[PDB]
Write a protein that binds this ligand. Structure first.
Ligand SMILES: [Mg+2]
Ligand SMILES: [Mg+2]
Ligand SMILES: [Mg+2]
Ligand SMILES: [Mg+2]
Ligand SMILES: [Mg+2]
Ligand SMILES: [Mg+2]
Ligand SMILES: [Mg+2]
Ligand SMILES: [Mg+2]
Ligand SMILES: [Mg+2]
Ligand SMILES: [Mg+2]
Ligand SMILES: [Mg+2]
Ligand SMILES: [Mg+2]
Ligand SMILES: [Mg+2]
Ligand SMILES: [Mg+2]
Ligand SMILES: [Mg+2]
Ligand SMILES: [Mg+2]
Ligand SMILES: [Mg+2]
Ligand SMILES: [Mg+2]
Ligand SMILES: [Mg+2]
Ligand SMILES: [Mg+2]
Ligand SMILES: [Mg+2]
Ligand SMILES: [Mg+2]
Ligand SMILES: [Mg+2]
Ligand SMILES: [Mg+2]
Ligand SMILES: [Mg+2]
Ligand SMILES: [Mg+2]
Ligand SMILES: [Mg+2]
Ligand SMILES: [Mg+2]
Ligand SMILES: [Mg+2]
Ligand SMILES: [Mg+2]
Ligand SMILES: [Mg+2]
Ligand SMILES: [Mg+2]
Ligand SMILES: [Mg+2]
Ligand SMILES: [Mg+2]
Ligand SMILES: [Mg+2]
Ligand SMILES: [Mg+2]
Ligand SMILES: [Mg+2]
Ligand SMILES: [Mg+2]
Ligand SMILES: [Mg+2]
Ligand SMILES: [Mg+2]
Ligand SMILES: [Mg+2]
Ligand SMILES: [Mg+2]
Ligand SMILES: [Mg+2]
Lengths: 118, 97, 196, 105, 55, 140, 288, 95
RNA sequence: UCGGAGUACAAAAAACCCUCCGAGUGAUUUUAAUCUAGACAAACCAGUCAAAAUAACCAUAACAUCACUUAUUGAUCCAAAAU
RNA sequence: GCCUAACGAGCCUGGUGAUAGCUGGUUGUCCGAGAAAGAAUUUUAGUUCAACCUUAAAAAUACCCCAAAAACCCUAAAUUCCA
RNA sequence: GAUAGAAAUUUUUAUCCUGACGCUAUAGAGAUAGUACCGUAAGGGAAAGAUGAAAGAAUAAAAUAAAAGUAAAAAAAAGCAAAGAUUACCCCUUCUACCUUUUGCAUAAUGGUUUAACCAGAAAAAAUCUAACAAAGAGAACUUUAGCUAGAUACCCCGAAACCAG
């Protein structure tokens, strides 16, 4: 039978080189995910279709942001072949309430707070 | 699909002719008339249909009961066959059961 | 109520012959197989030219139903109300006319701006003054009618309503009687305690 | 369909808007009924809007004919010689307004 | 059988019922029928409240 | 009350007018014509979608020609024009190629330059050189 | 009053030309024409159902039907012959008196209850009359002379406490019919029939003073009547010393339908006269 | 079921229903268990009891029996001495 | 038609003119009541458990047992019995 | 075999609009949602129940679900159940 | 079982106001006719009309010239016949007729030369929706622990071999 699939935890123990490679900090995990749906749910099992629905990933090539907490990481782990995950970065820091209109999200995965001054 | 080539004579109906102007006059005869005559009495028509209504089966059944013995042969026979057909149809055929 | 007035009287005599009532064609027009053509029973089937009608109207048909009393009463009340609110109701005394010339009536309605058509309601049939009967018998748009003949359809057909004064006293009572009334035990034509 | 019908190249009449812009709508003719219900919208339009419209567009003549008709029409007529017919039958005041604007532009 | 501004009656009814449900009760006003209609069974309390107002 | 369809004429005409220019009996007989017209419309919308691909392929062919003239293949020309932050869709590029042969030779020159710059930078193996045309501007 | 009226001045005449049925009143019917409702037209595909022939209602497809595998048991057994007593609570009786539909002044029997439309009897359904139930006992303050065809101890007590009188009387089906709708009976042009007796089953009910039966021995009445007052703990009033007492003692003959009329008379309602038989045989028959 | 009778043009009742079921006024139907008189020596005491019960029919059956039965059988009955009068109304049903 | 094992590897369910065993009852005495919360199972019909409470008995005394225990069975109507 | 060009039983009319779980057919436009089979059945060319689904309507939790938990010789992918 | 189905007992007010939300030549009667014609017989059973006030106005005068079929005018590489288009008809490019039936049809599975005219979803128990009045409602007969009354929403067409009577 084709079934769901366990994914042994050894997969998710990162090697020391990986930090260098994908550009994460060995010390501090990132706070937020940018998830994008790269592939299609057609031809995939219903349970993956549902996960993709409940992550707000319905529409392709649209970014969506999620907490980096384990509860979410479980679902992302299930559908990880359908998606692209990139850590959200805040060079200018979090937006205040004056900056809400001017926010924009750049493809390198970083959120710029002041967009197009004069 | 050819359509007539000439304008028909325009038919003028005057709405104020007697029958149209007086229409539905005594319909309230019961209420205003201290009930004596029910509006049924105003119905002109076949004896079995005055102040009564029903689907075709009920209609035929009733016609036969009332005027059946005054009917012509061919018409009575036709009426019977009609009844048998309607009986069979309504009772044994349909979608909804 | 207008719809009720229109339909409840109606009896359609329209009939069409089912394949059973057409004149002939008890026999199979040709043999079921081998002839090379389409198969048929009677030549009177609804497919065939002279044949019977598949559904079509059936028999004299009655459309008859009764709007419940209190509704038809409400109907009359509303018709009067609306005639009044729109300025087209005129309570008249009398009905005594100075003369039997209908032209008098026409020009009278022209002087008071009464509109094209007028419905004149009087208390009883025999008690109608003769001048009015004369005048209104030769008129198309003016219509004289007894109180028991008042109805929604006629009131909406004529632009202006003209009520005699005793007529108002009559209608008022007859119509109001229903707000306070019990449901009938047996028909109201029979003896009741207070009721005629 | 494209092979079914005629076609034309994109053009302007008299190189409009090159030197100066000339509103191409020349005249506008309404026909409605005072009595008939179908013309109801058209009547309201004649009351409220037409007047104002005529001031907004000084260069188009507007003829209004009450006549006994069942189907209110508006006939646009252009400098180009072109005549375009339209039916305002059974429409709002708003819809007629929009339509007349289309005709104007 | 409501003759008058029904909207007033709607105001008063939902203001009367609100402290009961913690929330404004759902309503339908039929202005032509002269009728008010309320989600839930409030019949007893409404009879009492209309009595108090002397109708 | 028997009701027949009186206006059947016009019902038919609204189909047949689309069929006039067909060959054969399709342009007359309502049966054949109805079918053919329906196929015509379907074919038409599908083609409405296709038309865009056709035109884009046309343009790419034309640009390919015009570039090959200057000794530059198509992919090279196009991506090295992108790497200059010159964004000109293919429609416009083809039109330049036909009606503005000079400006197009300029563009081709630009691209060839930028490409040579890229090779020079990949071969050089250092961060220091930035080719003049390889510099990346940000919005102001 | 109706501010709507004030708008009606502004608008054109209400005429036959503009009339709209209330929206939602007519759900428009749909016909099997067109792409949606055509081509098999809601009937499905082949089989017995598209052809219209699916079997009768209870038929399960040949397995022994549900409604026939269950065993027969008398439930509705002899139902047409059971006696049916339309209940009347003290609550409704009180509410009826309070609004002055029935008046407590004159004696209350079935006809009075019917005429107030406090109750409805249909003899055709084997209604044998009204039965009195105790629903409003605690709240019941009225003083009445009442006659019903059955009553419960608690109901009776509840009426006694207020100084009234209850009596249980029997009517046969024909009798009952006449009693509920008298005026249609008087247009019938027939004499007033004798009231039949109870059948053997109901005799022990109507012979007991327990039930204040109309056939009971009045010697027992005050005794049982007092027994009630012992049981429910209230002082039994002396009905004798009341001013309305003459009305309170009023009975019917066991053979008599109405109050003050007699078996065999004939009511001519157009002349407002009664007609009585002078014959010996007739008078022997009707008075037996 | 006959939907339109011949003589009266009305809708007949299927008596076979009236003999084995009982309709309360709430709309619940009540029936005996099947085989409750059959082969008793061969059965457990417990099972015997389970059989002796009066039980209720599920919705589907209830609608079926209603369709097979005319309006008369659904009227509110007041019988003297009736065992089942207690059960005709429904109480505290939150739905 | 009914049951046990495999097929169906670990909750349930799960087919074949698939692989294998069985059942259409004996033997015995502990002769195994009434009533009812709550559940299992289930298209329906049928099937299953079961506390408390009564009554029986030591005087605060309710599972018939064994044979792989699981299967040893049959609806309505209708007939015979009379409780 | 023959009985008026078709005789395993003539022809015609009537019963007759015979009856077909079988084949064929079933007529304007546009929009909202949308279905592959568990059970019985002289039943497997059909029905009637479930499960899904549609249209309204009332509600409150619904999927997803980490530990902990589910058998006795050996036994995998995995299930069940749940914050 | 499918189905069949009473009665006792109840109700019923005159005469005039007659016509048509019936058809208009494939409809409505089969009907111009039970004739022609077909059968030995019983029996079956058609189709068909259109000028005008006047044709005692035919060198005749007057308003459609619109179905398929043809003619005016045969064809010119290449392909479900069109569509995108195009200065340009073709030439280029892209699309495996339509119904039905099916697990699945371009299918070499079914049906249709074409045109016109005819030719097929019907019922109100429960329900929903709208409204009357409401512990009652219904113009008698019933139903009622918010109900009752009214309206509106619904269920096809052609076809056997047979069987029976005369
Ligand atoms: Mg025939
Ligand atoms: Mg025959
Ligand atoms: Mg052939
Ligand atoms: Mg036949
Ligand atoms: Mg005909
Ligand atoms: Mg697009
Ligand atoms: Mg329909
Ligand atoms: Mg369809
Ligand atoms: Mg079609
Ligand atoms: Mg089909
Ligand atoms: Mg099938
Ligand atoms: Mg009753
Ligand atoms: Mg379960
Ligand atoms: Mg115990
Ligand atoms: Mg022969
Ligand atoms: Mg058939
Ligand atoms: Mg079959
Ligand atoms: Mg699907
Ligand atoms: Mg069998
Ligand atoms: Mg189902
Ligand atoms: Mg777990
Ligand atoms: Mg949970
Ligand atoms: Mg049978
Ligand atoms: Mg003819
Ligand atoms: Mg003919
Ligand atoms: Mg032609
Ligand atoms: Mg080609
Ligand atoms: Mg096949
Ligand atoms: Mg299928
Ligand atoms: Mg294919
Ligand atoms: Mg093939
Ligand atoms: Mg071929
Ligand atoms: Mg094939
Ligand atoms: Mg073949
Ligand atoms: Mg083919
Ligand atoms: Mg076939
Ligand atoms: Mg075939
Ligand atoms: Mg076909
Ligand atoms: Mg063919
Ligand atoms: Mg109904
Ligand atoms: Mg439908
Ligand atoms: Mg036989
Ligand atoms: Mg047979």
């Amino acid at each position: 039978k084709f079934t769901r699939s366990r994914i042994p935890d050894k997969v998710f123990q990162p090697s020391p080189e990986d930090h260098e490679k994908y550009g994460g900090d060995p010390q501090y995990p990132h706070k937020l995910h940018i998830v994008t749906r790269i592939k299609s749910t057609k031809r995939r099992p219903y349970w993956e279709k549902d996960i993709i629905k409940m992550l707000g990933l319905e529409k392709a090539h649209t970014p969506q942001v999620h907490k980096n907490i384990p509860s979410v990481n479980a679902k992302l782990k299930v559908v990880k072949h359908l998606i692209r995950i990139k850590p959200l970065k805040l060079p200018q820091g979090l937006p205040t309430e004056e900056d809400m209109a001017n926010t924009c999200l750049k493809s390198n995965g970083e959120l710029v707070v002041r967009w197009l001054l004069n | 699909f050819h359509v007539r080539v000439t304008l028909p004579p325009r038919k003028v109906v005057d709405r104020w002719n007697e029958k149209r102007a007086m229409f539905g006059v005594y319909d309230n005869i019961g209420i205003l008339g201290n009930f004596e005559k029910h509006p049924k009495e105003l119905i002109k028509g076949p004896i079995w249909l005055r102040g009564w209504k029903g689907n075709e089966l009920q209609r035929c059944i009733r016609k036969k009961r009332m005027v059946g013995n005054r009917m012509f042969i061919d018409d009575l026979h036709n009426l019977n066959k009609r009844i048998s057909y309607l009986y069979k149809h309504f009772n044994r055929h349909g979608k909804y059961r | 109520v207008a719809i009720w007035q229109k339909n409840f009287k109606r009896i359609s005599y329209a009939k069409t012959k089912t394949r059973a009532e057409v004149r002939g064609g008890g026999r199979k027009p040709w043999v079921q197989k081998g002839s090379g053509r389409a198969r048929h029973g009677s030549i009177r089937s609804p497919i065939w030219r002279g044949g019977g009608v598949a559904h079509g109207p059936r028999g004299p048909t009655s459309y008859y139903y009764m709007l419940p009393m209190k509704v038809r009463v409400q109907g009359l009340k509303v018709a009067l109300t609306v005639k009044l609110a729109q300025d087209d109701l005129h309570i008249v005394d009398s009905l005594e006319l100075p003369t039997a010339d209908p032209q008098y009536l026409i020009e009278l309605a022209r002087y008071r701006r009464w509109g094209d058509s007028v419905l004149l309601v009087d208390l009883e049939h025999e008690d109608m003054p003769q001048n009015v009967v004369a005048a209104t018998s030769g008129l198309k748009t003016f219509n004289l009618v007894p109180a028991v003949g008042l109805n929604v359809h006629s009131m909406l057909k004529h632009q202006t309503l003209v009520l005699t004064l005793p007529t108002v006293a009559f209608l008022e009572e007859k119509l109001l009687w229903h707000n306070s009334r019990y449901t009938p035990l047996y028909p109201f034509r029979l003896p009741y305690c207070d009721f005629p | 369909t494209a092979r079914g019908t005629a076609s034309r190249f994109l053009t302007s009449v008299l190189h409009n808007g090159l030197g100066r812009y000339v509103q191409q709508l020349q005249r506008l003719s309404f026909s409605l009924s005072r009595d008939a219900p179908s013309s109801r919208g058209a009547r309201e339009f004649v009351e409220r809007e037409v007047t104002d419209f005529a001031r907004r567009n000084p260069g188009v003549v507007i003829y209004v004919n009450p006549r006994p008709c069942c189907v209110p029409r508006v006939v646009a007529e252009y400098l180009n010689g072109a005549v375009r017919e339209e039916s305002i039958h059974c429409k709002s005041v708003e819809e007629i307004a929009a339509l007349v604007q289309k005709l104007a532009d | 059988k409501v003759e008058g501004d029904i909207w007033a009656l709607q105001k008063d009814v939902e203001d009367f019922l609100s402290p009961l449900l913690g929330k404004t009760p759902v309503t339908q006003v039929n202005e032509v029928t002269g009728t008010l209609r309320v989600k839930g069974y409030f019949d007893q309390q409404l009879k009492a409240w209309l009595l108090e107002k002397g109708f | 009350l028997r009701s027949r369809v009186t206006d059947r004429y016009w019902r038919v005409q609204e189909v047949l007018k689309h069929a006039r220019h067909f060959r054969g009996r399709k342009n007359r007989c309502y049966r054949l014509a109805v079918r053919a017209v329906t196929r015509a419309f379907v074919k038409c919308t599908r083609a409405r979608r296709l038309k865009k691909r056709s035109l884009r392929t046309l343009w790419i062919n034309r640009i390919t020609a015009a570039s090959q003239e200057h000794g530059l293949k198509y992919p090279a020309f196009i991506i090295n024009l992108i790497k200059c932050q010159v964004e000109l869709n293919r429609k416009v590029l083809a039109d330049l190629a036909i009606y503005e042969p000079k400006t197009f030779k300029s563009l081709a020159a630009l691209a060839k330059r930028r490409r040579e710059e890229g090779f020079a930078a990949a071969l050089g193996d250092g961060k220091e050189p930035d080719g003049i045309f390889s510099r990346v501007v940000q919005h102001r | 009053g109706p501010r709507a009226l004030d708008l009606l001045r502004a608008l054109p005449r209400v005429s036959l030309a503009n009339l709209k049925p209330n929206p939602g009143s007519r759900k428009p019917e749909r016909r099997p024409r067109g792409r949606r409702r055509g081509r098999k037209c809601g009937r499905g595909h082949k089989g017995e159902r598209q052809r219209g022939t699916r079997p009768r209602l209870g038929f399960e497809g040949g397995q022994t039907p549900f409604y026939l595998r269950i065993p027969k048991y008398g439930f509705n057994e002899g139902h047409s012959f059971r006696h049916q007593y339309q209940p009347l609570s003290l609550n409704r009786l009180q509410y009826l008196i309070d609004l002055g539909r029935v008046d407590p002044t004159q004696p209350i029997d079935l006809t009075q209850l019917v005429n107030g439309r406090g109750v409805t009897i249909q003899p055709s359904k084997r209604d044998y009359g009204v039965q009195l139930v105790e629903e409003g006992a605690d709240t019941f303050k009225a003083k009445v002379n009442i006659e019903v065809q059955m009553a419960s101890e608690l109901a009776i007590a509840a009426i006694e406490k207020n100084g009234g009188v209850v009596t249980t009387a029997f009517y046969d089906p024909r009798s009952l019919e006449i009693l509920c709708k008298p005026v249609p009976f008087f247009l019938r042009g027939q004499p007033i029939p004798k009231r039949m007796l109870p059948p053997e089953a109901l005799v022990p009910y109507y012979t007991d003073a327990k039930n204040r039966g109309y056939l009971a021995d009045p010697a027992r009445f005050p005794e049982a009547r007092l027994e009630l007052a012992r049981k429910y703990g209230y002082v039994l009033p002396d009905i004798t010393k009341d001013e309305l007492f003459k009305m309170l003692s009023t009975r019917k003959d066991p053979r008599q339908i109405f109050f003050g009329l007699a078996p065999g008379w004939v009511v001519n309602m157009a002349d407002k006269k009664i007609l009585k038989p002078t014959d010996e045989n007739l008078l022997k028959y009707y008075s037996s | 079921v006959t939907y339109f009778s011949s003589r009266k043009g009305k809708r007949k009742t299927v008596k076979a229903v009236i003999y084995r079921f009982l309709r309360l006024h709430s709309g619940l139907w009540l029936r005996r268990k099947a085989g409750y008189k059959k082969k008793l020596w061969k059965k457990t005491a417990a099972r015997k009891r389970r059989l002796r019960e009066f039980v209720f029919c599920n919705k589907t059956q209830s609608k079926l029996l209603d369709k097979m039965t005319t309006s008369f059988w659904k009227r509110r009955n007041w019988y003297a001495d009736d065992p089942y009068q207690k059960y005709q109304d429904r109480t505290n049903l939150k739905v």
